[PDB]
Design a protein around this motif. Sequence first.
Motif, PDB file in Angstrom:
ATOM      1  N   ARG A  94      -1.968 -23.210 -18.842  1.00 59.42           N
ATOM      2  CA  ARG A  94      -3.539 -22.399 -18.780  1.00 59.42           C
ATOM      3  C   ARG A  94      -3.758 -21.111 -19.429  1.00 59.42           C
ATOM      4  O   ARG A  94      -3.027 -20.341 -18.934  1.00 59.42           O
ATOM      5  N   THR A 101      17.437 -17.211 -20.117  1.00 55.93           N
ATOM      6  CA  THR A 101      16.698 -16.094 -20.770  1.00 55.93           C
ATOM      7  C   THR A 101      17.547 -14.936 -20.495  1.00 55.93           C
ATOM      8  O   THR A 101      17.851 -14.346 -19.322  1.00 55.93           O
ATOM      9  N   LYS A 146      17.485 -10.722 -21.477  1.00 55.51           N
ATOM     10  CA  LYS A 146      16.773  -9.805 -21.914  1.00 55.51           C
ATOM     11  C   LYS A 146      17.680  -8.900 -22.848  1.00 55.51           C
ATOM     12  O   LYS A 146      18.770  -8.480 -22.508  1.00 55.51           O
ATOM     13  N   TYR A 187      -2.580 -12.471  -5.303  1.00 53.31           N
ATOM     14  CA  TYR A 187      -3.080 -13.213  -6.336  1.00 53.31           C
ATOM     15  C   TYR A 187      -2.131 -14.196  -7.159  1.00 53.31           C
ATOM     16  O   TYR A 187      -2.001 -14.142  -8.549  1.00 53.31           O
ATOM     17  N   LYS A 188      -1.130 -14.611  -6.541  1.00 53.09           N
ATOM     18  CA  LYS A 188       0.006 -15.471  -7.040  1.00 53.09           C
ATOM     19  C   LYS A 188       0.715 -16.438  -5.988  1.00 53.09           C
ATOM     20  O   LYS A 188       1.087 -15.658  -4.903  1.00 53.09           O
ATOM     21  N   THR A 189       0.844 -17.641  -6.260  1.00 49.58           N
ATOM     22  CA  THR A 189       1.287 -18.463  -5.219  1.00 49.58           C
ATOM     23  C   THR A 189       3.042 -18.360  -5.376  1.00 49.58           C
ATOM     24  O   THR A 189       3.444 -18.275  -6.438  1.00 49.58           O
ATOM     25  N   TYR A 203       4.532 -17.987  -9.427  1.00 47.16           N
ATOM     26  CA  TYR A 203       3.471 -18.429 -10.252  1.00 47.16           C
ATOM     27  C   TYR A 203       2.337 -17.295 -10.547  1.00 47.16           C
ATOM     28  O   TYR A 203       2.551 -16.277  -9.789  1.00 47.16           O
ATOM     29  N   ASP A 204       1.464 -17.647 -11.549  1.00 42.50           N
ATOM     30  CA  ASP A 204       0.555 -16.648 -11.740  1.00 42.50           C
ATOM     31  C   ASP A 204      -0.671 -16.866 -11.134  1.00 42.50           C
ATOM     32  O   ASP A 204      -0.729 -17.777 -10.190  1.00 42.50           O
ATOM     33  N   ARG A 205      -1.814 -16.145 -11.287  1.00 44.73           N
ATOM     34  CA  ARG A 205      -3.035 -16.445 -10.753  1.00 44.73           C
ATOM     35  C   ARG A 205      -3.604 -18.189 -11.242  1.00 44.73           C
ATOM     36  O   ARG A 205      -4.343 -18.639 -10.473  1.00 44.73           O
ATOM     37  N   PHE A 206      -2.887 -18.283 -12.411  1.00 44.90           N
ATOM     38  CA  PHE A 206      -3.313 -19.716 -13.082  1.00 44.90           C
ATOM     39  C   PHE A 206      -2.181 -20.714 -12.779  1.00 44.90           C
ATOM     40  O   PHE A 206      -2.364 -21.613 -13.578  1.00 44.90           O
ATOM     41  N   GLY A 207      -1.417 -20.732 -12.083  1.00 50.85           N
ATOM     42  CA  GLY A 207      -0.545 -21.509 -11.752  1.00 50.85           C
ATOM     43  C   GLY A 207       0.710 -21.779 -12.699  1.00 50.85           C
ATOM     44  O   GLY A 207       1.058 -22.903 -12.625  1.00 50.85           O
ATOM     45  N   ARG A 208       1.025 -20.846 -13.393  1.00 48.01           N
ATOM     46  CA  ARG A 208       2.231 -20.896 -14.471  1.00 48.01           C
ATOM     47  C   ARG A 208       3.425 -20.100 -14.100  1.00 48.01           C
ATOM     48  O   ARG A 208       3.199 -18.927 -13.697  1.00 48.01           O
ATOM     49  N   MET A 242       6.564 -18.162 -13.473  1.00 49.72           N
ATOM     50  CA  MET A 242       6.628 -16.818 -14.352  1.00 49.72           C
ATOM     51  C   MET A 242       8.115 -16.304 -13.649  1.00 49.72           C
ATOM     52  O   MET A 242       8.524 -15.037 -14.214  1.00 49.72           O
ATOM     53  N   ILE A 252      -9.747 -15.292  -8.254  1.00 48.07           N
ATOM     54  CA  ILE A 252      -9.478 -16.732  -8.038  1.00 48.07           C
ATOM     55  C   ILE A 252      -8.046 -17.166  -8.532  1.00 48.07           C
ATOM     56  O   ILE A 252      -7.765 -16.691  -9.751  1.00 48.07           O
ATOM     57  N   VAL A 253      -7.367 -17.765  -7.634  1.00 50.60           N
ATOM     58  CA  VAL A 253      -6.117 -18.205  -7.799  1.00 50.60           C
ATOM     59  C   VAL A 253      -5.985 -19.798  -7.995  1.00 50.60           C
ATOM     60  O   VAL A 253      -6.503 -20.537  -7.141  1.00 50.60           O
ATOM     61  N   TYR A 254      -5.400 -20.360  -9.091  1.00 46.87           N
ATOM     62  CA  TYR A 254      -5.396 -21.558  -9.465  1.00 46.87           C
ATOM     63  C   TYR A 254      -4.068 -22.147  -8.825  1.00 46.87           C
ATOM     64  O   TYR A 254      -3.093 -21.446  -8.543  1.00 46.87           O
ATOM     65  N   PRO A 255      -4.068 -23.306  -8.458  1.00 41.43           N
ATOM     66  CA  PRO A 255      -2.734 -24.159  -7.872  1.00 41.43           C
ATOM     67  C   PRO A 255      -1.707 -24.248  -8.828  1.00 41.43           C
ATOM     68  O   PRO A 255      -2.187 -24.125 -10.079  1.00 41.43           O
ATOM     69  N   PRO A 256      -0.288 -24.258  -8.511  1.00 41.07           N
ATOM     70  CA  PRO A 256       0.543 -24.178  -9.610  1.00 41.07           C
ATOM     71  C   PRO A 256       0.212 -25.457 -10.566  1.00 41.07           C
ATOM     72  O   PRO A 256       0.193 -26.522  -9.994  1.00 41.07           O
ATOM     73  N   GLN A 257       0.548 -25.255 -11.899  1.00 40.26           N
ATOM     74  CA  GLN A 257       0.634 -26.391 -12.776  1.00 40.26           C
ATOM     75  C   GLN A 257       1.758 -27.192 -12.737  1.00 40.26           C
ATOM     76  O   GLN A 257       2.963 -26.624 -12.638  1.00 40.26           O
ATOM     77  N   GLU A 306       1.344 -11.849 -21.609  1.00 42.07           N
ATOM     78  CA  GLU A 306       2.589 -11.412 -22.457  1.00 42.07           C
ATOM     79  C   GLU A 306       2.347 -10.440 -23.362  1.00 42.07           C
ATOM     80  O   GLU A 306       3.029  -9.542 -23.612  1.00 42.07           O
ATOM     81  N   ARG A 311       6.505 -20.064  -3.833  1.00 44.59           N
ATOM     82  CA  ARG A 311       7.082 -21.423  -3.332  1.00 44.59           C
ATOM     83  C   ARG A 311       8.501 -21.361  -2.846  1.00 44.59           C
ATOM     84  O   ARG A 311       9.379 -21.860  -3.011  1.00 44.59           O
ATOM     85  N   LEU A 368      10.952 -14.344 -17.007  1.00 38.06           N
ATOM     86  CA  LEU A 368      10.648 -15.148 -17.967  1.00 38.06           C
ATOM     87  C   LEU A 368       9.703 -14.542 -19.433  1.00 38.06           C
ATOM     88  O   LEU A 368      10.195 -15.047 -20.425  1.00 38.06           O
ATOM     89  N   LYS A 369       8.879 -13.759 -18.911  1.00 40.74           N
ATOM     90  CA  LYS A 369       8.121 -13.119 -20.185  1.00 40.74           C
ATOM     91  C   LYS A 369       8.619 -12.027 -20.992  1.00 40.74           C
ATOM     92  O   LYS A 369       9.227 -11.200 -20.050  1.00 40.74           O
TER      93      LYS A 369
END
Lengths: 166, 108, 152, 148, 275, 287, 132
Positions: free
Chosen positions: A23, F27, F29, G25-27, G65-70, G72, A11-16, A89, G29, G115-116
Amino acid sequence: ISRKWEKKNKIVYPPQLPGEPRRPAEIYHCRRQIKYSKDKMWYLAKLIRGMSIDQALAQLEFNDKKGAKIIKEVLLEAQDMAVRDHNVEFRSNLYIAESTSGRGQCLKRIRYHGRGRFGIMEKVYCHYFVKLVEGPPPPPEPPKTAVAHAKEYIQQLRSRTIVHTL
Amino acid sequence: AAPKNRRTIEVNRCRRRNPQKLIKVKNNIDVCPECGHLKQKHVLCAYCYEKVCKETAEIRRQIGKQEGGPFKAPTIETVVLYTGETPSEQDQGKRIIERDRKRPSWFT
Amino acid sequence: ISHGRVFRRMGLGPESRIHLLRNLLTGLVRHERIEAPWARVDEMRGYAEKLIDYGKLGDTNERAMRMADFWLTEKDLIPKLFQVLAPRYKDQTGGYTRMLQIPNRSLDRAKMAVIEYKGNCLPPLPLPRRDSHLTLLNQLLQGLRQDLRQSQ
Amino acid sequence: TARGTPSRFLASVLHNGLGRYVQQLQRLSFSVSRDGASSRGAREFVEREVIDFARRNPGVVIYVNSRPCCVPRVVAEYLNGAVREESIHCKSVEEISTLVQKLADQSGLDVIRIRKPFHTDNPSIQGQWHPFTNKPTTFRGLRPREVQ
Amino acid sequence: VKKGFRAAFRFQKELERQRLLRCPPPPVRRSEKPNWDYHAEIQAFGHRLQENFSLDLLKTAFVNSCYIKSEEAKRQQLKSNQELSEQGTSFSQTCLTQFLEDEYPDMPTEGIKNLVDFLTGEEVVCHVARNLAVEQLTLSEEFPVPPAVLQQTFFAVIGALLQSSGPERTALFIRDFLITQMTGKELFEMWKIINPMGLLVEELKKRNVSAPESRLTRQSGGTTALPLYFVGLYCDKKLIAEGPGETVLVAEEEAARVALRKLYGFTENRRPWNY
Amino acid sequence: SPTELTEMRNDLFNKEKARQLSLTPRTEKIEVKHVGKTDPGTVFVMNKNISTPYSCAMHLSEWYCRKSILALVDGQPWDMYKPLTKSCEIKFLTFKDCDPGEVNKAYWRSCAMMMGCVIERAFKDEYMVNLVRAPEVPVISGAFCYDVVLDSKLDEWMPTKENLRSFTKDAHALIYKDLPFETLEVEAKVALEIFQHSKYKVDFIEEKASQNPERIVKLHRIGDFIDVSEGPLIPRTSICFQYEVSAVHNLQPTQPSLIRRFQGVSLPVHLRAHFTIWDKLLERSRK
Amino acid sequence: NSDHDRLHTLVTEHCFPDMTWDIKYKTVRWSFVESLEPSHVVQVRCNVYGQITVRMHTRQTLAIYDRFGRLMYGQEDVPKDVLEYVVFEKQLPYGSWRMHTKIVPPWAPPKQPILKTVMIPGPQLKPEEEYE
RNA sequence: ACUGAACUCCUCACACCCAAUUGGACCAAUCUAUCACCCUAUAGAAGAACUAAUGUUAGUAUAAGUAACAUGAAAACAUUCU
Ligand SMILES: [Mg+2]
Ligand SMILES: [Mg+2]
Ligand SMILES: [Mg+2]
Ligand SMILES: [Mg+2]
Ligand SMILES: [Mg+2]
Ligand SMILES: [Mg+2]
Ligand SMILES: [Mg+2]
Ligand SMILES: [Mg+2]
Ligand SMILES: [Mg+2]
Ligand SMILES: [Mg+2]
Ligand SMILES: [Zn+2]
């Protein structure tokens, strides 16, 4: 059979939006058809529910039950995939949100009894499921103190109404 | 005697989820300073003990090769020497077991 | 009721217990380090110490020779017991054996112990070392000791 | 049964009778079928009675949709947002008329057990009873067995 | 497999119902759902309220500025209800002030203003609009309509009623649909106050009356965890109002509230509003 | 007012934090290699001037985070929450190392700072309290000491047993709060701007800026309380388990102003001491 | 938009896994903004497959982004200048020109930093083994 | 005096509390004729309706993680010992 737990990682959530809390990551992992009773696996699952990944691994490494090694392997795999693919991370920044044991597909065998009678042994198999959530483990629900508990009592007293009347 | 009634799942849960049956959390787990793997306070580190057992097995294979046959236990002390080591003054008059690897740091 | 009973019930009986301890002790004398179930090691530690004492008694002592002959199934160890182990501990008065707990046996999760004879040539065990004297608590206690010494 | 069913208290929508009466029903939607014995009664109702009802209830918007349908229906939407769907399958013209009139006269609140047949926002006019009503006071408010 | 179609259809319907209940679709404005005709709906709105609205005025009231902006933005790829809402809000405030001053002449200007603010507030006006179907007929760029926009639309509708039928009919409408909202409401439930004892002291000073003496009229369970204290305020040895409480301070505060209610004539057993 | 002074000092602290963060944008590294005895050869690619040795421990495991008190970045002790600057070699120091002396010194300084905070926020409003310095005494001394000048109105007043116990209760409240030890390398100019009012801290800042090659000074904050640090401190206050403000001795040579040395003693969670040993340590911590 | 159906006709099969594998499994843009210098051919070579190398120096944006839309990788607003050497291939009957491979020169500047923070574990030594 | 039913009254509505047996009005689902065409109608048919037969088959529970079962010892896993 059902295999929804594996799909749950897809499941892929939309960008926050920038002004949105980050999240926490979530990784669903499982091992199917473990030669172990689900009843016995449930004790280990309950043991490691709600604990950090490192604490759970430490607890399982020193447990004599056979399911402990299997759960440790599953947790290590979950950690590896969380870091590699789910953009987690820190390895240690994971806690077991959910851990349960499910009945697997079992086989029926015959147990010979004394007088030509028999019983049906079941070669029991169980599934094992874990959800790893990124972030420190949630604090344990603190026991309710006398102050709050008497507060609840007084609220119940105040909630009283004149029943069965106008 | 046979059961008189099927025990309900509620009663069974009450029984088999009791704290007396739940697995107790161990609080004597610690990190071994030497290697950093997990150990119990009163138990030897598994990793370090495996190191020691493997080195002992190698030394014992060398001892068996030297003895060459059952019932050949020496009547004199034994000293293990690694590559680049020479018998010392007190090592004189003691059977020498030679190892092809260098002296382990933990071994002394 | 087993008040004051100091000997474990092992094997198939008293004789079988004696033989099990005898085999464990013979292995201990041969290898100078043995892994075995914790209870059996604890039971055999006393017999190991007693063999060291009998070896100290001397090669020419008939009673010591008979005891060694019984307790060492492999007779090549009797010269070893009387000429290596006993001379090694001639200075010491006791504590010839070091027993430590080991992670439970993978097979049956039995409580395992490693027992060795002190001063053997084998690599040292990862012995438990007390905290360094330079820790915070130990330094505070050192201050206590110095102050008490100076005052009195 | 009551214990196995939600319950509410007798109430109106917006104090529907205080100032003026506002008919709570606001929308009726009749899905009817041109062909089909099921909706013969609905067709007769649309032919003969729907217009009279519409002009009798100007505050209700009535929609009639002729669509292939094996079960004709009437959906009533009330002001409070409630939606009640009633099948008029094989109902006679009189049955449909009575059902529609009941919907018109009904309010949007759920048809569930009503705890009390009455509802007063000002139950007391002389002061709700409390333990100290009917209890005489004493000089200097001295409790029983008080020395002073 | 069992031959047949009706059981399968019924089971599909049940599965659809359960799926909808578990994951209901996002709310959609009624305009976008089937069986919707805006002209008929607005005419029925007027007839339901039993008022001869002018249709153009009502349409202009129901259309909002944000809706116009969104519509123009979409067209890139109408008269708002601002003035009507302003007129309706002004008239509603003045008329509610008139009603409240006539009903409670002893109520201070501050209390009257607070009651009017409560009646015209976002919560009450939003509830009234929602149960009057103003939200359904509201033209806004987002759904559900935000309470501010809903309140503006409701007051625009009131202004349209004023421009159509007149001040008397609009006053009747307000009496019916906002003055009724304070039925069963308590004075300080509608007008939040702080330090009712201080406010009562101020009121008595205005009335040229000495500060009340708080005195313990009745008591029960003083040393327990559930005490009852009835505290009365005495003016020149005359009881003006007594109130209960759990602690003496709370009882005194509530007695001050009761005294304020009696002074302002907003007692629980006051004369009911006349319609 | 003291509340205003704390507010403005915290404002300056946050301004400096933001200034340094902006000065280090984006950032970059940096490679930090774990040179410690355990888990050798691991390498962390870390955000320049953002990540911390605590982040490195987070990557390693939870045990490192819970047991590591200091970091020897390139042979120098770094606070576990001090941002890393450049690619380096890192080794985590715990309380039970072979030579934990540096960790002991950091713990001693952190306890002294906690005592200073308690002292500054203990007395009543009318009395004025000036934190002169945290003398760096050996742990063998049996007590960490903090030097404070109290008001002339209190120069004749000695704390009672109840007052000392109240100080301990405040310190334990701080420990329960468990506030992290925020750190900053701040130029002497900004340090003097922050501590302009306190003459003692001004001169201490000048001394430190003279000692170091540049004018860089170590500012530390637990919560709402900023102080000049003689060196690296503990990550968090919850490391402290046993804590006891033991005594307050008035320094004999005090002609200009009466300096009082608050002596206390503490032990971390890792090194809990039994009740009797703790009582004896308390007795010896009153000298 | 993960329009793999069109991507199949737009890029070669050799390129498609590179285009789409790591991005699952990542959006993303990705967006385009006006180029800096006009794209021009570099060289061409040749059962028979065409091959054309085109050098582009354009300006682009990323926000992965990630699967969770954050987020990266990369800012979504700030664009970057990209120098690419894109190689097209063609089938020689109905095939067209599709991206075959991007040649990254050794002298190309390092890409945008991650980023991470990341960890690279050292040798997981067995008991007998010793760190070197 | 009061309490006190499913008796009786009161507002409204009424075919809506006897075993075996008997009369009657409806009806789930299936197929056929013809309709219908988000589930149906009028009829014709019939393997036409299961809280119960120590019912048959299959699944999973309870008893129960219980009864019960198993690998002599050390070791270089060469080997040796009991
Ligand atoms: Mg047979
Ligand atoms: Mg036995
Ligand atoms: Mg009666
Ligand atoms: Mg009757
Ligand atoms: Mg049948
Ligand atoms: Mg059935
Ligand atoms: Mg049956
Ligand atoms: Mg079971
Ligand atoms: Mg039993
Ligand atoms: Mg048994
Ligand atoms: Zn170790």
